[PDB]
Amino acid sequence: HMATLKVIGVGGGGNNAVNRMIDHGMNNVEFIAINTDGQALNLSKAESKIQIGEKLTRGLGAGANPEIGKKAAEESREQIEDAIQGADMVFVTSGMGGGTGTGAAPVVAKIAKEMGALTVGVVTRPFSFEGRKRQTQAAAGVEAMKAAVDTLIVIPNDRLLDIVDKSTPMMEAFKEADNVLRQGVQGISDLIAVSGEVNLDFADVKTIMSNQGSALMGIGVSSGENRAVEAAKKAISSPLLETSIVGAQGVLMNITGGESLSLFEAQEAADIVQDAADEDVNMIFGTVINPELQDEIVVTVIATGF
Ligand SMILES: NC(=O)c1c(F)ccc(OCc2nc(-c3ccc(C(F)(F)F)cc3)c(Br)o2)c1F
Ligand SMILES: Nc1nc2c(ncn2[C@@H]2O[C@H](COP(=O)(O)OP(=O)(O)O)[C@@H](O)[C@H]2O)c(=O)[nH]1
Ligand SMILES: [Ca+2]
């Protein structure tokens, strides 16, 4: 039996991320759009849509009030439960600092976690230009999210200002933030579908991610001379995430390479991840030999327990 994967967008930012993943097309993944705002939800491409808090907001947004988001989700608990039914893994994605995301996303997470699903949060923190109130609501939102999920990935939107030039379109910057969740979902789909030479399965994902807190995640791609060290360095250097690898107690790591993937290379990449941790780790290590690949290597890393 294959693990059932569901991705849930909660509020404006959450649903923007989901709409872009639906645009790409993820085949074995179920998408769920959750919002207070009915106009926005009507335009979603998601095949499962839940309008929350109709009695409370009359089909409008939460107007940046997290109490309205939270009570909206509590009003609609049974419809959330129904949409999540059957999930083995749930990704909850949302922008913190607004009303719907901040308030409803932790309610959604708690529902997913009590249904037995491995519950991963992927959230943003507001830009400093949005101001102190917005940042404060977001901090409370992150804390509520941390209590409700198995593992949380936090992307401060301020980090987008470190990866743009003065002309990079705003939408193109948002796509980079979006890639964290998209490549994460794809990585798990791959892990579940493909039998590895050193095989990792969904029980290995649960061991590393179940009942943790903050997580670092990344992917590194390289080829040529120093490909193993370069790939591993890129996977653990995640400029968009709040959490760094230092102090990690649990690591899931996979290397995908062609027939030339050397044992020496595998140790080099794994030593980069071990060393950067700076701890006595529980590493679960996997490898895939894809005979389609020539000189390209792909290292993927999830690091938890700080
Ligand atoms: N070695 C394998 O059995 C294997 C395979 F055949 C294909 C892909 C694969 O892993 C891809 C991968 N995906 C992840 C991963 C882990 C966590 C997350 C998160 F955090 F849920 F987003 C997302 C992706 C990792 Br670490 O590695 C394998 F381990
Ligand atoms: N990275 C990113 N952040 C967003 C996006 N849309 C909104 N945000 C952020 O998420 C916060 C909450 O906005 P929104 O999710 O639209 O409000 P909600 O609908 O009440 O949850 C905003 O303060 C922005 O910082 C997006 O598309 N990408
Ligand atoms: Ca596998």
From Swiss-Prot:
GTP binds at residues 12-16, 99-101, 130, 134, 178. One of its GO terms (molecular function) is GTP binding. Signal peptide: none annotated. It is found in: Cytoplasm. Keywords: Cell cycle, Cell division, Cytoplasm, GTP-binding, Nucleotide-binding, Septation. It comes from the Bacteria. The keyword Cell division applies. GO terms for cellular component: cell division site; cytoplasm. The keyword ATP-binding does not apply. GO terms for biological process: division septum assembly; FtsZ-dependent cytokinesis; protein polymerization. Its main location: cytoplasm. Homodimer. Polymerizes to form a dynamic ring structure in a strictly GTP-dependent manner. Interacts directly with several other division proteins. Belongs to the FtsZ family. Essential cell division protein that forms a contractile ring structure (Z ring) at the future cell division site. The regulation of the ring assembly controls the timing and the location of cell division. One of the functions of the FtsZ ring is to recruit other cell division proteins to the septum to produce a new cell wall between the dividing cells. Binds GTP and shows GTPase activity. This is Cell division protein FtsZ. It comes from Staphylococcus aureus (strain MRSA252). The gene is ftsZ.
